[PDB]
Amino acid sequence: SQFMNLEGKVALVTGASRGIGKAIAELLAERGAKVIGTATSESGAQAISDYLGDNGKGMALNVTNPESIEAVLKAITDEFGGVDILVNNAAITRDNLLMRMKEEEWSDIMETNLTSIFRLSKAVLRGMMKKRQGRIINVGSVVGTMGNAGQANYAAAKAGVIGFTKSMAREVASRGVTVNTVAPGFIETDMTKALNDEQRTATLAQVPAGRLGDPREIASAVAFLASPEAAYITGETLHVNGGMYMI
Amino acid sequence: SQFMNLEGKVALVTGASRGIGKAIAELLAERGAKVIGTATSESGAQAISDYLGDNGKGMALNVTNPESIEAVLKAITDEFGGVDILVNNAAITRDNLLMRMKEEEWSDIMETNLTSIFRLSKAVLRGMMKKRQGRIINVGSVVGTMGNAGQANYAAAKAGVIGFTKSMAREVASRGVTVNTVAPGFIETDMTKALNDEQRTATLAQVPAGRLGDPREIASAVAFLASPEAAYITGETLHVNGGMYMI
Amino acid sequence: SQFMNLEGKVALVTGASRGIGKAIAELLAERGAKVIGTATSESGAQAISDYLGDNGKGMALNVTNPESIEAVLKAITDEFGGVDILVNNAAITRDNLLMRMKEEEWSDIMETNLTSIFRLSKAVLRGMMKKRQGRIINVGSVVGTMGNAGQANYAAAKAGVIGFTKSMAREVASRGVTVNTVAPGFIETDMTKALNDEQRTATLAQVPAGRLGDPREIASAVAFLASPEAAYITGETLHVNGGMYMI
Amino acid sequence: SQFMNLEGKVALVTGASRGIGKAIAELLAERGAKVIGTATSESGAQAISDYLGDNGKGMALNVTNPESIEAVLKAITDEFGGVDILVNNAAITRDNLLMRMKEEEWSDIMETNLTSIFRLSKAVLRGMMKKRQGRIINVGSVVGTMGNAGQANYAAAKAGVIGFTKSMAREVASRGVTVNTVAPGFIETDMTKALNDEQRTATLAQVPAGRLGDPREIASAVAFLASPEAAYITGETLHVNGGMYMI
Numbered sequence: 001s002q003f004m005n006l007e008g009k010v011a012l013v014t015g016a017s018r019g020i021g022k023a024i025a026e027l028l029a030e031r032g033a034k035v036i037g038t039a040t041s042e043s044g045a046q047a048i049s050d051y052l053g054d055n056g057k058g059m060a061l062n063v064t065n066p067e068s069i070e071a072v073l074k075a076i077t078d079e080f081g082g083v084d085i086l087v088n089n090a091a092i093t094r095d096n097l098l099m100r101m102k103e104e105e106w107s108d109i110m111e112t113n114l115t116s117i118f119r120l121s122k123a124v125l126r127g128m129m130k131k132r133q134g135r136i137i138n139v140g141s142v143v144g145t146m147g148n149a150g151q152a153n154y155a156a157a158k159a160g161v162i163g164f165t166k167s168m169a170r171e172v173a174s175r176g177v178t179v180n181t182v183a184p185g186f187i188e189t190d191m192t193k194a195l196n197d198e199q200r201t202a203t204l205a206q207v208p209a210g211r212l213g214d215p216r217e218i219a220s221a222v223a224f225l226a227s228p229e230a231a232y233i234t235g236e237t238l239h240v241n242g243g244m245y246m247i
Numbered sequence: 248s249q250f251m252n253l254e255g256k257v258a259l260v261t262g263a264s265r266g267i268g269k270a271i272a273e274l275l276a277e278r279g280a281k282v283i284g285t286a287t288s289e290s291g292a293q294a295i296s297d298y299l300g301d302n303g304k305g306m307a308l309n310v311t312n313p314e315s316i317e318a319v320l321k322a323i324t325d326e327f328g329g330v331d332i333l334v335n336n337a338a339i340t341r342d343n344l345l346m347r348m349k350e351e352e353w354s355d356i357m358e359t360n361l362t363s364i365f366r367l368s369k370a371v372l373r374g375m376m377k378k379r380q381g382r383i384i385n386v387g388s389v390v391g392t393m394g395n396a397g398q399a400n401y402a403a404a405k406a407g408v409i410g411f412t413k414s415m416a417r418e419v420a421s422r423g424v425t426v427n428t429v430a431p432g433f434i435e436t437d438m439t440k441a442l443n444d445e446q447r448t449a450t451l452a453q454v455p456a457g458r459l460g461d462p463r464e465i466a467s468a469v470a471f472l473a474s475p476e477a478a479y480i481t482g483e484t485l486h487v488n489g490g491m492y493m494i
Numbered sequence: 495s496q497f498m499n500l501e502g503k504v505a506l507v508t509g510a511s512r513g514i515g516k517a518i519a520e521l522l523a524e525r526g527a528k529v530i531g532t533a534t535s536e537s538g539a540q541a542i543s544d545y546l547g548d549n550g551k552g553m554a555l556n557v558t559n560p561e562s563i564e565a566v567l568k569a570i571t572d573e574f575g576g577v578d579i580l581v582n583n584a585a586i587t588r589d590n591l592l593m594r595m596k597e598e599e600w601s602d603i604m605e606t607n608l609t610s611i612f613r614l615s616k617a618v619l620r621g622m623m624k625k626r627q628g629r630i631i632n633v634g635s636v637v638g639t640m641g642n643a644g645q646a647n648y649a650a651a652k653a654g655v656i657g658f659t660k661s662m663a664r665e666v667a668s669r670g671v672t673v674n675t676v677a678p679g680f681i682e683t684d685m686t687k688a689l690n691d692e693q694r695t696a697t698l699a700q701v702p703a704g705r706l707g708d709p710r711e712i713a714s715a716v717a718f719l720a721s722p723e724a725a726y727i728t729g730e731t732l733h734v735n736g737g738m739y740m741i
Numbered sequence: 742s743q744f745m746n747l748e749g750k751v752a753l754v755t756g757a758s759r760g761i762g763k764a765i766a767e768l769l770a771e772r773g774a775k776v777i778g779t780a781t782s783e784s785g786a787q788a789i790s791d792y793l794g795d796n797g798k799g800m801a802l803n804v805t806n807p808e809s810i811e812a813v814l815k816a817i818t819d820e821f822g823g824v825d826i827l828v829n830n831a832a833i834t835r836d837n838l839l840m841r842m843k844e845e846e847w848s849d850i851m852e853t854n855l856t857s858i859f860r861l862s863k864a865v866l867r868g869m870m871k872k873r874q875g876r877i878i879n880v881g882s883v884v885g886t887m888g889n890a891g892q893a894n895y896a897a898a899k900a901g902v903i904g905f906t907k908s909m910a911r912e913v914a915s916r917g918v919t920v921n922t923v924a925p926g927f928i929e930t931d932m933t934k935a936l937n938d939e940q941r942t943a944t945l946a947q948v949p950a951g952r953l954g955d956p957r958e959i960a961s962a963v964a965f966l967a968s969p970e971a972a973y974i975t976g977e978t979l980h981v982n983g984g985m986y987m988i
Contacts, residue, residue, distance in 0.1 A: 003277070004250070098859075099867060101863065107856070118839075118842075118894070126840060144904050147906070147908040148908055149911040153859070156855065156859070156901040158904060160898065163885050163900025163901065164897040168888075170455050170493075170888050171838060174456065209421065210421040220471075220474070221477075221480070232464040235455075238480075242481060243420045246482035346620060368592070373593060395664065396665040402660060403661070406660075407653050407654030408650070410639075411646050411647075414646035415641075415646050418644070493887065498745060498961075663984050664949050668949060703914045703975065704915040726983050730980050730988075731988070732979065734973050734974050735973070737910050737911060737914045737976045
C-alpha cells in the first residue's frame with residue numbers, strides 16, 4: 001500500500017550485523033527502502049549483504065574515522081543516490097562506576113556514541129537539505145533520559161545525542177528534514193542474554209510490561225519515524241521501554 | 248501485509264465527524280479495524296456511518312453522560328465484540344485569560360477533556376484486561392506540555408490526561424494493555440482556517456517546520472500506537488508538532 | 495539579612511495544620527512573611543493561629559467552596575493587605591485501582607486537587623497583577639510526573655496543576671508574577687507513618703537517597719521559590735524526591 | 742541564621758572571573774562558604790582573590806588538563822580541607838550551523854563543556870563519599886533542554902552533562918552526595934551585551950518575563966541547591982529562564 005511506504009528511499013543503518021540494527025535494516029527493506037547496513041569489518045559487511053539480498057548491501061564503516069565515512073557515502077551515492085534516511089545505531093558500552101571509570105573508557109564512549117553522530121549526520125545532511133527531504137533517526141537508550149549507575153559515560157553520550165538532535169531539528173526543519181531519537185528500554189539481545197538470572201529478574205522488576213522488548217519493536221518505531229507520514233515529527237524522543245520510564 | 252495490521256480489532260474513536268477524529272477513523276479502517284466513530288448528534292453519527300461504510304458505523308455519544316457511554320458500549324459489544332482500541336479524541340475549547348475565565352468554562356473543559364477520559368477508559372478496560380490485550384490512545388495537545396496563555400483550562404485538562412495515562416499504563420502493563428497519548432501541535436482544521444492571516448502567520452512563526460500539520464499526520468501516529476508493533480510503548484506521549492516544542 | 499527575605503509579603507498557605515503545610519507556614523513566617531494558614535475546621539484554624547502567634551493567623555477555608563474563598567480573602571485583605579504569595583497545599587487522596595475507582599473518588603480529587611487551584615489562583619491574581627509582583631506556588635507530587643498505579647485520579651490532578659501552572663506562567667510573566675510547582679517525593683507524614691514495615695521498605699527501595707524526605711525539605715523549596723531571588727523562575731516544577739524520579 | 746547556611750563548607754567554583762561564575766562565588770561566600778574560584782590564568786586568579794578577600798581565594802585551573810586539576814585540589818585540601826561543593830561553571834561556545842561546524846569546534850566543546858565535568862566531578866567525589874556529604878552542581882543552559890540552531894555542539898555537551906548528572910546522582914545518593922544542574926536562560930553578561938539591538942529584542946521576544954536574567958539569579962539557585970536544606974534534591978535540573986522553556 002502507500003502507507004508507511006519507503007520505496008525510493010536510500011537508508012544507511014549503522015551497526016546492522018545483529019540485534020536492533022539488523023531488525024531495523026530488515027524492516028526498512030521490507031517497507032521498500034534500499035538499505036545499506038554497516039559493520040566495523042568486511043566479514044560483518046558480508047553477513048549484512050547476505051541477509052539483505054536484492055534489497056541492499058553491507059558495507060564496512062569505521063564510525064570514528066573521517067576517511068571511511070567519505071568512501072562509504074561516495075559508494076552509496078554512486079550506486080543508490082543520496083542517503084535519504086540515516087539510522088545511527090552503532091554504539092558501544094564501557095561500563096564502570098565513576099570512581100573506577102578510566103579516561104579511555106570516557107573518551108571511547110564519547111567518540112563512538114556521540115562524536116560519531118555529529119560526523120555522520122553532518123556528512124549526510126547537505127544532500128538531504130538540497131532535496132528538502134530527509135530523516136535522521138538516532139537509536140538512543142532509556143539510560144540517556146533516566147540515567148543509570150555504572151553507565152555515566154553511556155548516559156552522557158546518549159543524552160548528548162538528544163541535545164544535538166533538538167538543535168539539528170531546529171536548524172533543518174523548514175527544509176523538510178526531520179531529526180529524532182528512538183530510545184529503547186531493556187531489549188533482548190546478546191548482551192542481555194549474557195546476564196545471569198538474578199540480574200535479568202532485577203531488571204525486569206523495573207519494567208511494567210514484565211518482559212524484555214524485541215529488536216523488531218525498536219525497528220517498528222524507527223520505520224515509523226522514517227516514513228513520509230512522520231513528516232511533522234521532529235526533535236522528538238520516542239520511548240520504547242515497556243513503561244520502565246514515562247516522560 | 249501483516250505490518251501495522253488491525254484486522255480483528257474493534258476501534259472506538261470519539262468525535263470522529265471531521266478533522267483529526269475523522270482522519271483517525273478512516274486510517275484505522277484502512278488498516279483493517281472495525282471502527283465505531285462518534286458524534287454528539289444523530290446526523291453526525293449518520294455522516295460517520297456514511298464515510299465508514301462496510302468498515303464500521305457511527306453512533307451518537309455524549310462523552311460527559313454515563314448512561315450514553317453504557318448504551319454505546321453495549322451496542323458495540325453486541326454487534327462487533329468488545330472494544331480493543333479506544334481513541335479519546337472528543338474535546339472542546341473554552342478559551343479565556345484567567346481573569347475572564349468563567350467557572351463553567353473551567354468545569355466544562357474538565358468534564359469534556361479529562362473526566363470523559365477517566366469514564367471511557369474505565370468502561371473499556373475490563374474487557375481489554377480479560378483478553379490481556381488492548382490499546383487506549385488519548386489525543387492530547389502540545390498545549391498540555393507547553394502551556395498556552397488564554398488556555399489554562401485546556402492545558403490543565405490535557406496535562407491531566409497525561410498523568411492519568413502514566414498511572415493507568417503502570418496499572419495494566421503486565422496485562423497487555425498499553426495507554427499512550429498523541430500530542431498534536433497546530434494542525435489544519437476548521438478552527439485554524441477561521442483564524443485571520445496575522446494569527447496564522449504568528450502561529451507558523453513558532454513552528455520550525457513552517458507549516459501546519461495535516462489531520463492524517465495525527466492519524467498516522469495513532470494508527471502506529473494502536474498496532475501490534477507498538478506493544479512495548481506505554482505511558483508515552485508522542486509529540487507531532489513540527490518542532491514547536493521538543494521534549 | 496536581605497537574603498531570601500519575605501518581610502512585607504502576605505502568604506496564604508492552604509492546609510497548614512500539619513506535615514508539609516505546617517512546615518511551609520512556619521518557614522515562611524521565619525523568613526518574615528505574615529502568614530495565613532488554613533484548615534477545614536475552626537479548631538484546626540485555631541491550632542494554626544497558636545503556632546504562628548504574632549507572625550500570622552489561622553482561618554477556616556473550604557477550598558472547594560467559592561463563598562468560603564471570597565470570605566477568607568476579604569478577611570486577609572482587610573487585616574493584612576492582599577495576598578502576595580499563594581501556596582496551594584491543601585489536597586486529598588482517594589486511592590483505588592481504576593476498575594474499583596468510584597465516580598465520586600474521581601470527582602472529589604479533581605475538585606480538591608485541581609479545580610481548587612484554578613479558583614484560588616484566579617481569586618488572588620488580580621491583586622498581584624495590579625502590584626506587578628506575586629508568587630503562586632503549587633505543592634504537587636512526584637506522582638503527577640511519574641504516574642502511580644492505584645492513584646490515576648491523584649496523578650491526573652497533580653499533572654493538571656502543572657499544565658495550569660505553565661499556562662498561567664505564560665499569561666502573567668510580563669506582569670511580575672511567577673507560577674511554579676514544588677513536587678515532593680515520599681515525605682515523612684502521618685500517612686507514611688501509618689504504612690506497615692513492608693510498605694515503607696518497598697517505597698524506600700525506589701528512593702536512591704534511601705530515606706523519606708522531611709516536610710521542612712519541601713518547605714525550603716517553597717520558601718526559595720517565594721523569594722525575590724527566584725523572580726526569574728516561572729512555569730517550573732521543582733522536584734524534591736531523593737532521586738525517585740529524574741527529569 | 743541557620744537557614745541556607747554554608748559555614749564549614751568548602752566550595753570550588755570554576756570560571757569565577759566574571760558574570761554568573763563570579764556571582765556564584767560571591768553568594769556562596771556571603772552564605773558562609775570558604776570559596777575557591779578559578780580562572781584559566783594567574784591574572785584571573787588574582788582578580789578572584791581580590792573580590793573574595795578573607796572568604797576564599799582564586800586559583801588558576803586548566804579544566805581540560807589532569808595535572809592542573811591535581812595540583813589545585815591538593816592545594817585546596819591542604820589549606821581548607823576537602824571540597825564539599827563543586828560548581829562546574831567554566832564553559833565555552835564555538836557556535837556554527839552544522840554544515841559550517843569544524844571538527845575542532847566540536848571537539849573543543851566536548852572537551853571543555855562535558856569531559857571537564859567528568860574529570861572534575863570524579864576528582865572531588867571520593868572525598869565527598871567518605872564524608873557521606875557533598876554537592877555537585879553543574880551550570881548548564883536552557884539550550885541543553887530546548888536545543889538551539891547554531892549551537893548543536895554546545896547543546897550536545899550541556900545535554901550530556903544532564904545524562905551524566907542523573908547517572909552520578911543514582912550512584913552516590915545513598916551516600917549523601919547530591920548531583921544537580923542549574924539551567925540558565927538568557928542571562929545578562931558580556932556576551933549578551935555584545936549582541937546588537939535586533940538580536941536582543943528577538944531573543945527577549947521568546948522570554949515571557951520580558952527581560953534578561955541577572956547573574957545573581959543564577960547564583961541564588963546554585964546557593965539553594967548547595968544548601969543543607971536541598972539534601973533531598975538530586976538528579977534534578979533547575980530551570981531559571983523567565984519562562985523561555987517550561988518542562
